Design a binder for these strands. Sequence first.
RNA 1: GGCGACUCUCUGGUCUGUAACUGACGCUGAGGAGCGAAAGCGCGCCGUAAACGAUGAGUGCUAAGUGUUAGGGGGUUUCCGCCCCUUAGUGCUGCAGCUAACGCAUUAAGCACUCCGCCUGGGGAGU
RNA 2: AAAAAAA
Lengths: 708, 64, 95, 101
Amino acid sequence: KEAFMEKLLSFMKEEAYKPLTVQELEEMLNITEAEEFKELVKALVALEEKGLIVRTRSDRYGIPEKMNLIKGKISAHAKGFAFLLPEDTSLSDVFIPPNELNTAMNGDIVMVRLNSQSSGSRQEGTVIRILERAIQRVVGTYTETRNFGFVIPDDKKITSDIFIPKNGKNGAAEGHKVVVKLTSYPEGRMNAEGEVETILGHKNDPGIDILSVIHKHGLPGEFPADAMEQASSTPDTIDEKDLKDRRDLRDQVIVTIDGADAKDLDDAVTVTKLDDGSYKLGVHIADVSHYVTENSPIDKEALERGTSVYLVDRVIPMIPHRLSNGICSLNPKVDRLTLSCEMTINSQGQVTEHEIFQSVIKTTERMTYSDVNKILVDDDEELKQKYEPLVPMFKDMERLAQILRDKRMDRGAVDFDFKEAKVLVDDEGAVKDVVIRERSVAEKLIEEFMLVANETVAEHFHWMNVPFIYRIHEEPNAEKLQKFLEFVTTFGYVVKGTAGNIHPRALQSILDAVRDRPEETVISTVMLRSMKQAKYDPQSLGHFGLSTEFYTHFTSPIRRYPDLIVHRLIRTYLINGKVDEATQEKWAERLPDIAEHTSSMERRAVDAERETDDLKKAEYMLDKIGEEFDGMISSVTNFGMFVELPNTIEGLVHVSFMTDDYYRFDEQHFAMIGERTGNVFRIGDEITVKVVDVNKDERNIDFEIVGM
Amino acid sequence: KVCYFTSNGITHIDYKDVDLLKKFVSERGKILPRRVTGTNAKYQRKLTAAIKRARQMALLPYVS
Amino acid sequence: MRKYEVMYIIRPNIDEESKKAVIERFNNVLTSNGAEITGTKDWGKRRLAYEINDFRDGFYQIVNVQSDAAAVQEFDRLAKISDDIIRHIVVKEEE
Amino acid sequence: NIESGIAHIRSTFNNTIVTITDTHGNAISWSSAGALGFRGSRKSTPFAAQMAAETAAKGSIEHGLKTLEVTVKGPGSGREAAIRALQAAGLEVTAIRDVTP
RNA sequence: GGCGACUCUCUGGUCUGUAACUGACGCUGAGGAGCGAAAGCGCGCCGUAAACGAUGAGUGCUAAGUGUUAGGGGGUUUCCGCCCCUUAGUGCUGCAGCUAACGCAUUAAGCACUCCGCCUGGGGAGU
RNA sequence: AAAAAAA
């Protein structure tokens, strides 16, 4: 027993050791008999009792003493406590009490000592050392006192007011939103001090709510002067020299299909039906890489931005509005340079032949998604008569998209078809209406045409075996997916598979089963919360969500920097023929940094976008205080339950407002159960709620239960 | 939130039409409530019977 | 006389010579007791939803008739006795 | 040498027992939380159920099983984890059946 | 009182619509007869039951608002769907009135007529 | 809260 314990401890004391589960230790030690497995379990218990190893709350055994600790990122809470997120994502979160934070702020990389006694269900710890500081700038509202100011942070995870000394005011008045640079951190009983770096405006001025968010997330402001000079210097028409070595496609029937308000038209499409019954799809993408050359002023800015950001009232573009809307845009009935992906596609949706080449197009018409729907779905005779020459292509497009879809779904892609909000605002940025974003036939057609192209490009460059950027989606978290599999068995949905080896189709089968059920929205939602996020990578590690081995982003270089790179690599490798070792080594060095950065800038964009949506949703609901709505329970917690309305507005029912009974949370079923009444509110029950309180600043909506 | 049988004008539910009934059981095999399906009262009855006949004849299961 | 619908399941472990004999037997029962077979489907060997008498499949026969109770009643009697027919139901055709 | 079987999971509040049988209900193998030397609260927990399922399952794989039907009895928390442990041991689950009396 | 697996066998009632027929043939109903828990117990007697929605039956009259169950008609509507009106039942809310107040309020505890049951301080004593 | 994708 002791010799086995020593051998296990010595193995765990190797420098290459990472914390492992019981099953991972079984495999790594090559334990095959059931009796040796018992010995391992008794040894792990005995060593954990002695304190020589620690089981994390994700059931992974690590040597504390090499730590007695865990390195990780702080995730603070607005009530003064935090959680450690360990660097090893396979490990569980460690709770940190407010008194044990030891001056650590939200996002800070820390080292946390594990407490030998937990007072609750999760593992507790103390911050012993802050390795890196995350927060240097803080947005907030300035407030003036006699001798000093203070700024109340917009991030409520910063629970303490930032002292501003009288010299660090720099012009800020009472109620001004300000950007504060931290000069000192909190220490003992002293709050953080800082100087006002920028004044945004008064908090009551139109659009300083949105401008605060832009500043909180550190989103890019105005373009640099040299970028603005480069953009201004770029021609508004094509030079005849640039038509050299480009396939002339100006006489073909080519069309863009976008939103009515879209000015940045990245993509144009054509579909010809061949005599054999196969389809020829031409996807033609804006040649941004021509105009924005490598290491140009606009290029350096486009890398720093990483993506365009689409906030409620405005778009922050990745490249200046002169290029994006002007020469790079595939504007109607003018000559435009394009990097084209042309594809012969059979009756099974299989790309038999393809070609990637530079071209010049002249778009026959700029269509919208509403017009194309009216033609195909609504059978509108006025619009058909208006666009009579294009109607035959639109019907062959629809069929082709349907074929591709069928192939994509068959292959086992996960159609995650959820209802998204679209906040409508006026010119002043006051909220008019929150409406459901509906994905029509016209969007789902284009989608399919952007997908197959993206898949085509990625496959080509995989087989070329040159340094390239992919858009990957790794397999889901086995712990997160395991819990999801438990959750769906409560509703009766049984899944074939284990969490470690799930094929996308098996997930699709569920989403098919729940379709047009009350439990749809949430199982959907909880499935999502089991998935990993998709990221850019130099390696082709496949795309779980699309159930494909090869995927990239090619089809939107105006608004995404990884698409602009794909174009430059296309130009480099295919067009110029520069497949030399030095060219490869250059790109192999730079793509990892690009892929990590751009992936960060995407996540940043999404977080900000959402943060403005939640703010404007809260602004919409201010006048609805007292009004009753029907909604569905989207999430249940120990403190209350979330209810989503029909327009995807979500608000909390706090357990305090549940005055009819003492409600106990059940975590296994996802339900609050009354002790006395025996009323059970579960995830996915429809209920009628009334609006009690809405805090716009906090972005909170509070609901009370009227009836079930 | 509409009745299948009032929508599609179906006066007679049949126990033999297994496919049709299978819409209206849970995955486990339990009869789905009117509130979930949106069924009309009248038909909820008819439907229940049929499933009950069905299940007797081993067309449907009692517990999938 | 009033319309009924008989359904019944024949055990899956018989050849088509035996099967036919069943059908003709039980068709003979009905018409022998004053019934008239108006329709006669054969749904063929289905998987049973559960395991009846240690069989996971069976051959379904759906006889429509018009008859007196006596006919249907005799059928039911014999249907029960018989080992070939594993389960059955008679049902009136609701007006 | 039998391939298909049933896994009878009796998950009580105190314990989880996992018997595996052939289709005729003859006992191939079994394990339980207390057979793996869990004691008191630990026998109740889903981790012990999980481990009980594995040990019952690994015994069945020697006897050459591949597919399972599963039956669940009792209110305990083990059934969810235990079932996954039958899938995770390798044996594919056809259908799970709650046969609580 | 009560009645929830399914099918068949026999049988009771109710509601809607038509208005073809009969032509007041109706209502209540002591006694009587039958049905009708625990129990009591010896399946049978027993039969007493917050067998008390604490509220006999019948008929007519007397604001509204809203839900459900089974129907009828018209409107659009192809129909589905909606809209409206009507019938029967079951709900909530609320005038007039009633009420000691509480409450009831076309499912009256309102306004009436018919007939029946029942009460006339508590205890003693359901002896 | 939390997914693609689109924009």
